[PDB]
């Protein structure tokens, strides 16, 4: 959605329509600052969302002694050490697919063979 914030007061901008040009403008509700939008999308509802599948991956994820290790091959550096974990979305509708993080290039790949 790419929230936009005002330049002069840092408040949130809102979409407005200018019929003189039939375009989309983003204006502030208190200080009268306007800016033309770069994209025509203003709202998005994600009923089925995948944001958070790999949440929590950091530069030292391999230091975690509790994460299980695997021998799968990383298809970006050809290394065999890696830590894997299941999806981090706590909806009781997510698949049991695994996510692998390589301990040599920080690349994240998956075991999915259905859709990938």
């Amino acid at each position: 959605t790419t929230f936009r914030f005002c330049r002069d007061c840092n408040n949130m901008l809102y979409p407005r329509e200018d019929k003189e040009n039939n375009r989309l403008l983003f204006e502030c509700r208190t200080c009268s600052y306007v800016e033309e939008a770069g994209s025509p999308l203003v709202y998005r509802h994600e009923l089925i969302t995948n944001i958070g599948e790999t949440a929590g991956v950091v530069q030292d994820i391999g230091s975690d002694p509790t994460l299980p290790r695997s021998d799968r091959e990383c298809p970006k550096c050809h290394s065999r050490e890696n830590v894997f974990f299941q999806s981090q979305q706590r909806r009781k509708d997510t698949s049991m697919v695994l996510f692998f993080v390589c301990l040599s290039c920080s690349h994240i790949f998956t075991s999915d063979q259905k859709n990938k």
């Binding site: 407005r16 509700r29 208190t30 009268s32």
Partner: protein, 163 residues
């Protein structure tokens, strides 16, 4: 800023209906032209002297106002990093002079976008309507209500320059 600038301590209540320095100067000009038993026993609760001193000293926050009221910043006392800072002033010879720091104040601008009042705000918060109109501030700006100190002073100053 529009010089001169004043940095004093003052009450911040109703810091939208306080006379600007320029307005006061103009009013001074026209004024000159115009004239031309207790319970006998109570308990005090011990309070650390330092906090009471801090409470009394910081009761009236710093207010930084320019001449025309265009800039009005209110300072707030910060205690997280107040007494661990040190200042090095670069003299005009390459050298450094060290000065301990006393306090840190965080200043936030006031009255730049024509804020409402508490009574007006509460009427809108209550079910006057399902939700406040998106462009209410723009609408009320044209009616003339809810102006700023800067505009409230400029129109008065122009009301004098016109004569």
């Amino acid at each position: 800023f529009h010089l001169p600038v004043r940095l004093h301590r003052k009450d911040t209540r109703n810091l939208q209906f306080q006379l600007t320095r320029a307005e006061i100067v103009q009013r001074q000009k026209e004024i000159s032209e115009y004239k031309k038993l207790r319970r006998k026993t109570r308990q005090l609760k011990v309070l650390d002297e330092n906090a009471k001193k801090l409470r009394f000293e910081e009761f009236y926050p710093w207010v930084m106002e320019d001449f025309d009221g265009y800039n009005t910043w209110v300072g707030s006392y910060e205690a997280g990093n107040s007494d661990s800072y040190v200042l090095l002033s670069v003299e005009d010879d390459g050298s450094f002079t060290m000065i301990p720091a006393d306090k840190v104040y965080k200043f936030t601008a006031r009255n730049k976008y024509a804020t409402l009042t508490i009574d007006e705000a509460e009427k809108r918060m209550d079910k006057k309507s399902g939700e406040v109109p998106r462009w209410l501030m723009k609408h009320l700006d044209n009616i003339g209500t809810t102006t700023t100190r800067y505009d409230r002073t400029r129109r008065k100053l122009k009301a004098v320059a016109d004569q």
